[PDB]
Amino acid sequence: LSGWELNVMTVDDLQAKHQAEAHAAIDAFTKYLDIDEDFATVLVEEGFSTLEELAYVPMKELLEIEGLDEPTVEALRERAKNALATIAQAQEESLGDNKPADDLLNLEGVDRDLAFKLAARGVCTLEDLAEQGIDDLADIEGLTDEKAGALIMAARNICWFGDEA
Amino acid sequence: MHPMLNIAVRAARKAGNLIAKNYETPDANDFVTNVDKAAEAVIIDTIRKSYPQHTIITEESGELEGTDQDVQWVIDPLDGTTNFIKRLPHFAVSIAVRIKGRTEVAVVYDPMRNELFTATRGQGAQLNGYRLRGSTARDLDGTILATGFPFKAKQYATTYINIVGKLFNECADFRRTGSAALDLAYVAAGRVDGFFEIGLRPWDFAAGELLVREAGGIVSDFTGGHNYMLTGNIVAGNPRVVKAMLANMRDELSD
Amino acid sequence: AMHPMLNIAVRAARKAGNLIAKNYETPDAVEASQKGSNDFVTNVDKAAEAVIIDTIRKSYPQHTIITEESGELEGTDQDVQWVIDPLDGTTNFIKRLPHFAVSIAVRIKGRTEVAVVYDPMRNELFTATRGQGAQLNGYRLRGSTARDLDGTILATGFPFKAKQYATTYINIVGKLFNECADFRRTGSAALDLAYVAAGRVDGFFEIGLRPWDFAAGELLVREAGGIVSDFTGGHNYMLTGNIVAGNPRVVKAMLANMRDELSDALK
Amino acid sequence: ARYLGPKLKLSRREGTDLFLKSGVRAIDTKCKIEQAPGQHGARKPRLSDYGVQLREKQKVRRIYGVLERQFRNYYKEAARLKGNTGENLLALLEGRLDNVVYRMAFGATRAEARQLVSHKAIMVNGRVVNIASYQVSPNDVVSIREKAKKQSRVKAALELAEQREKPTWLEVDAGKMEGTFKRKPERSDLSADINEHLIVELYSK
Ligand SMILES: [Mg+2]
Ligand SMILES: [Mg+2]
């Protein structure tokens, strides 16, 4: 009708991400603001998203704006140590859903790297392995048709041939 | 992956037009072989317009080989010929685009009801603009099973009968249409939950297995392996009904 | 010309089929409402039934009507009965499988007089009136030309509501599969009968059918050159829900084949 | 995973102004990023759409169905023509036979055009000159041979041309199964999502 192409993603969530994305990270800004609500907001005129380099600017930036006191900048640098450690820890956590279990590790032809490969397609349980054929479990980096075949067979023994769990 | 399916659906539409336009003439197996050959002819000649080098596998003359052996094209311009013989309006053209031994594209097209199910890895299985889902069942209560009888291999029938018997004591009802490809297409759109057949042949169900798989389902041979590609003792559906059916049908194995 | 009651019935069937087809494209509105052992009765069945009854009442406020849902609505002139199935094969509709039909038959003095079945999906209209024959959108219907059991296609329904006879039925099934060519199982006795009238199946049989389902097909196959009977050649079928029908020779062969396997419960 | 670290490295390995930070002060002045103001200044020879230019070259080549060697030959032949080169390219590439074939539907594809010109199915000036590399002068009549106008191929392709956009600059005779050309189409009657001045500056820099 409108002729204008349309896009439908969200209206409350995930929509500021298009334009209000550099001001919507509620964690750090408000975790610093809860004691700043008496003092002030934060200084938006610099991005400081990439806080590392732009924090190594002289008194000019610290003189121009108030609220980011010298002990404030130093305590917040310790908290930014906490923040870079938080980024590293989030990196660590983002690599946790692979699900190597005994029901998924000791099976024939399954090393821990076979676990990492099968979940590298998105298999976070054993039943999922029994929910694909050789054609669909393909494209794995180092998984032929007969190996995956016997693996599907093992999954369907532990699941569907003995009809158990 | 677009242009392969493009040629596929082009040949499918032309073949269906031919089949229907012919079906509008009266009669009371000469004619069906005539129209089968004519449809295959139009299909292949429209194919050679693009990639006249892929190896075509029909259901009649074995494997019409080609100079570019990277892609096989499984063809059946008519399945369940019995239908078109006896005027029953239920039959579809089945085209399958397979590569390296496995299949990538599939198109089944019913001319009469003008249904057209496409399917391809990742991009899913569509019915003229529908992200198909398969059925929603998780059990064998209030469910439908698209069955199939060995109208050429009646020896299994007895144990087959047993299966039916036990199946009837478990499931809710049965269906039977004769077009195995259409059974597959129906389990793809969840029109019927589970499908099974004794001793089919790849030229027919090649596209249908790709359909049911792409629609979130899975296939199997009677003994859970994958020799179906050579044995055609198919059992297909969403994993729920496949377990709920295999658990009760494997104990009567004869193939 | 045309038979009057037939005409009003086909108008009713057209309206009902259009309603069913219009609702067929919104499966989020029609729910599964079960009545007995896997005999769903969705609200769409109720709506189609009401539409048919309304359309009839315009032209016969006095004719007693029969319906699986509303039982038997009496009329001031109960010599003529209107048997209806607004939907046949409710299961095929709930699974959104596009193979079903509405069936309207009119009996006079007990003997069935006119019948129509309508499939909206394929848009096929099997009409039949005694003393004039059966038509499929304008073509006469002389059933299958089969005269044996070889090469014959047998449509059937399974007793999936009277499963006690399952074995028995299955028993005979096996016997049949030793002589026939192939089976058909569609899920709507009305449409199966219709196909018998069109020769698209060389015969048909079923156990456990309600009296308000074959009433629209038995006349169809009768004026289609075919015949019906119970599992023994009698006529108690109207009470046993056990039907076997087809062109005469095939019916004879089927009866002679089935009489032995038959469990004496149905006899 | 929150980007709270190296910005020089981030916006240099990305090399573009994705607008992560607002960037209130001039970015190039804060540090030595690869991007300098006054775009035409620091890299004085610079052609806009610097990476897609060759992709659009392959596009015009796929619609022409031609190769690079004859493309550069046409280029050197057109550089000798007095006038605007940005239009003379398309002019000399329009004065050929296979293009007007794709138009008048001998072959519905310019590749099928080259096939039919190489298939001895194109009589030009009433003479069999099947080499596709001629410049058939405008105001000329071309058709298919007189013994092949009942074919499935010819009838199909001519009906196809009839079903495509009918050129006002090429009198297509679907009954006479031919084409009569008068003059190459000017700026008005060509595609409006194409680049030639950029191609001219790339071939003339
Ligand atoms: Mg076939
Ligand atoms: Mg009913």
Short mmCIF file of C-alpha atoms and ligand atoms in Angstrom, two decimals, chain B residues 36 58-60 75-81 92 94 203-204, ligand 1:
data_model
loop_
_atom_site.label_atom_id
_atom_site.label_comp_id
_atom_site.label_asym_id
_atom_site.label_seq_id
_atom_site.Cartn_x
_atom_site.Cartn_y
_atom_site.Cartn_z
CA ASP B 36 4.36 -40.06 -18.82
CA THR B 58 14.35 -41.15 -14.29
CA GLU B 59 12.20 -44.07 -13.13
CA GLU B 60 12.22 -45.84 -16.51
CA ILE B 75 12.70 -37.10 -11.93
CA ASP B 76 9.24 -38.56 -11.75
CA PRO B 77 6.65 -36.76 -13.90
CA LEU B 78 4.02 -39.10 -12.48
CA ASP B 79 3.78 -41.03 -9.22
CA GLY B 80 1.05 -43.46 -8.29
CA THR B 81 0.10 -43.82 -11.94
CA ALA B 92 2.12 -34.86 -8.45
CA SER B 94 8.45 -34.90 -8.18
CA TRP B 203 13.11 -41.91 -7.85
CA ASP B 204 9.81 -41.27 -6.07
MG MG E 1 6.70 -42.12 -11.57
#
